[PDB]
């Protein structure tokens, strides 16, 4: 004539802040590049476009 309770419960692990699978949804976005420009008698100048 006795009773043992013994409940259980699932929670996030402590290593979930260092490796996890992020789940993203992708739409169309911007396109960038980088160019190297020289013309005539000047040196190469580069910029992000």
């Amino acid at each position: 004539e006795n009773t043992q309770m013994s409940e259980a419960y699932v929670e996030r692990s402590e290593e979930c802040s260092i490796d996890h699978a992020k789940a993203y949804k992708v739409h169309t976005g911007t396109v960038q590049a980088m160019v190297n420009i020289t013309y005539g008698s000047v040196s190469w100048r580069s910029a992000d476009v």
Binding site: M5, S6, E14, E15, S17, I18
Partner: protein, 53 residues
């Protein structure tokens, strides 16, 4: 203190012990206490860290 019990045999009476000066981590292999047991926290020493192997 004391309380000499007026019964005969030692096999027909259970005994317990209430120590509350210190506190223990709530294991799954220990019996739960009486009422509201508080949520007081201890830090975990060796946490994961991202290093170079």
């Amino acid at each position: 203190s004391d309380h000499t019990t007026t019964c005969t045999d030692v096999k027909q009476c259970r005994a317990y012990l209430i120590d509350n000066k210190k506190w223990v981590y709530n294991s799954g292999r220990l019996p739960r206490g009486e009422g509201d047991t508080f949520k007081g926290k201890l830090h975990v020493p060796f946490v994961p860290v991202k290093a170079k192997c």
